[PDB]
């Protein structure tokens, strides 16, 4: 299968990116420095780790894949790759596997060194809850990263130049992390006798950073819909990215 033969490239090319390895080191340092000041000073520190991995796992995903399609079109290899025995689906899906296992490893160095700083600085942490609250944490942080990976394929395929891809990937990172929730807070303060209280939990499903925190805080909705709503953000935006990539 050539979806794996093009996936082995993106592992070898993504792990030598100096821009990624600075951020993945800074993600692992700050995950220790929160865990050090969460133990010396486990649900109280997994909420501060959720605010950390909402900052950086969209940033890691957009640093990897903002130049996945348009970076190959500018490099000229994209026109070369289409003349190989390869569909346009297998190029995108193979990049999604290759970029997906990078930030599936960046949470295993990220939280693998954070859970070590919890299991060795609490002395009585009751580790049977640790390997289930971090197993639900490492899976949900990867799925958050796979959304913004699929968001990065949408904005890479739309633009025609590498400089305007980073101008939109910064715009997507501003909008989906810290502008959409600020206009939620703004709506409440400006309008308090008109806005529906019930509507806001449902309106939280239009933001995958918000769905990420709701599966680390365990509410009118159940838990199982949020797993199928985070996977729906992957499956729609990858299908949207495949629909854009077939129109170049």
Partner 1 sequence: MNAVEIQGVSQRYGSMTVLHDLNLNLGEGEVLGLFGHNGAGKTTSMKLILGLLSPSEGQVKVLGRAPNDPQVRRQLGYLPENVTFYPQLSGRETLRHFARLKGAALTQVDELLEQVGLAHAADRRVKTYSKGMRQRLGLAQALLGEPRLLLLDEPTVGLDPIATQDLYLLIDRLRQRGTSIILCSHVLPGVEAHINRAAILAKGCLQAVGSLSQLRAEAGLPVRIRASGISERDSWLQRWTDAGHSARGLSESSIEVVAVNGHKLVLLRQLLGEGEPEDIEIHQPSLEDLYRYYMERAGDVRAQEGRL
Partner 2 sequence: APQSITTLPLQPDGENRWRLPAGEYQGQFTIEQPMQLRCEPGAVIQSQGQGSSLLISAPDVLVEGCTLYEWGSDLTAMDSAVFILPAAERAQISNNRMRGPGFGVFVDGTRDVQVIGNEIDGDAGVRSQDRGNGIHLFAVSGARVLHNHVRNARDGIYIDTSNGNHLEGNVIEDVRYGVHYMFANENSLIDNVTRRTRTGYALMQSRKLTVTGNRSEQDQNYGILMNYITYSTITGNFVSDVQRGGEGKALFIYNSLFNTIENNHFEKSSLGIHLTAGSEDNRISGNAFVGNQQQVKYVASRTQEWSVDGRGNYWSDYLGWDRNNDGLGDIAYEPNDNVDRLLWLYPQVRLLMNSPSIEVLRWVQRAFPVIKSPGVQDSHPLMKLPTEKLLT
Contacting residues toward its own copies, per CB under 8 A: 18-19, 22, 167
Q: Which of 24, 54, 140, 142 is in the footprint of partner 2 by CB under 8 A?
A: 54
Is residue 129 within the footprint of partner 2 (CB under 8 A)?
Answer: no
Closest listed residue to residue 205, CA positions, set 220, 189, 192, 187: 220
Smallest separation (angstroms) from partner 2 to the CB of 163: 26
Dihedral sign of CA atoms 218, 219, 224, 230 in order: negative
Smallest separation (angstroms) from partner 1 to the CB of 2: 6
Q: Which of 129, 200, 206, 236 is in the footprint of partner 2 by CB under 8 A?
A: 200
Going by C-beta distance under 8 Å and a sequence separation of 6 or more, which residues neighbour residue 7? 94, 95, 97, 98, 101
**CA separation for the pair 230, 216 (Å, rounded):** 13
Is residue 22 within the footprint of partner 1 (CB under 8 A)?
Answer: no
160 contact, one of partner 1, its own copies, partner 2, none, CB 5-8 Å limit per kind: none
Three-class SS of residue 190? helix
Contact 123, 44 (CB under 8 A): no
| Residue number with CB closer to partner 1 (212 or 245) | 245
| Residue number with CB closer to its own copies (44 or 189) | 189
Three-class SS of residue 56? helix
Contact 191, 208 (CB under 8 A): no
**CA separation for the pair 182, 30 (Å, rounded):** 24
79 contact, one of partner 2, partner 1, its own copies, none, CB 5-8 Å limit per kind: partner 1
| Residue number with CB closer to partner 2 (185 or 224) | 185
Closest listed residue to residue 106, CA positions, set 173, 66, 56: 56
Is residue 48 within the footprint of partner 1 (CB under 8 A)?
Answer: no
For residue 41 the two structure tokens come to 């000073």
Write out the residues near partner 2 by the rule CB under 8 A. 34, 37-38, 41, 44-45, 47-48, 50-52, 54-55, 177-179, 181-182, 184-185, 188-189, 191-194, 197, 200-201, 204, 209-210, 213-214, 216-217
- Contacts with partner 1, residue ranges (CB under 8 A): 2, 5-6, 8-9, 12-13, 16-17, 75-77, 79-86
């Amino acid at each position: 299968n050539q979806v794996w033969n093009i996936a082995r490239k993106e592992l070898s090319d993504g792990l030598r990116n100096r821009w990624l390895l600075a951020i993945s080191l800074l993600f692992a340092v700050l995950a220790v420095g929160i865990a050090w000041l969460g133990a010396a000073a486990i649900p109280a520190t997994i909420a501060s780790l959720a605010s950390l991995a909402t900052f950086l796992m969209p940033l890691i995903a957009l640093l990897l894949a903002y130049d996945a399609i348009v970076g190959e079109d500018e490099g000229g290899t994209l026109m070369l790759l289409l003349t190989y025995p390869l569909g346009r689906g297998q190029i995108l899906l193979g990049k999604f596997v290759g970029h997906g296992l990078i930030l599936a490893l960046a949470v295993l160095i990220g939280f693998g060194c954070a859970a070590l700083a919890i299991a060795l600085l609490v002395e009585g942490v009751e580790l049977g809850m640790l390997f289930w609250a971090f197993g639900r944490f490492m899976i949900s942080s990867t799925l958050l990263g796979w959304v913004f990976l699929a968001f990065a394929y949408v904005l890479s395929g739309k633009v025609n130049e590498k400089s305007s891809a980073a101008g939109l990937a910064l715009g997507v990172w501003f909008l989906f992390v810290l502008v959409f929730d600020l206009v939620l807070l703004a709506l409440l303060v400006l309008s308090e006798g008109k806005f529906n209280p019930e509507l806001l939990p449902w309106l939280l499903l239009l933001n995958p950073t918000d769905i990420y925190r709701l599966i680390n805080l365990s509410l009118p909705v159940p838990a199982a819909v949020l797993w199928l709503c985070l996977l729906a953000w992957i499956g729609v935006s990858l299908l949207l990215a495949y629909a854009i990539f077939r129109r170049r």
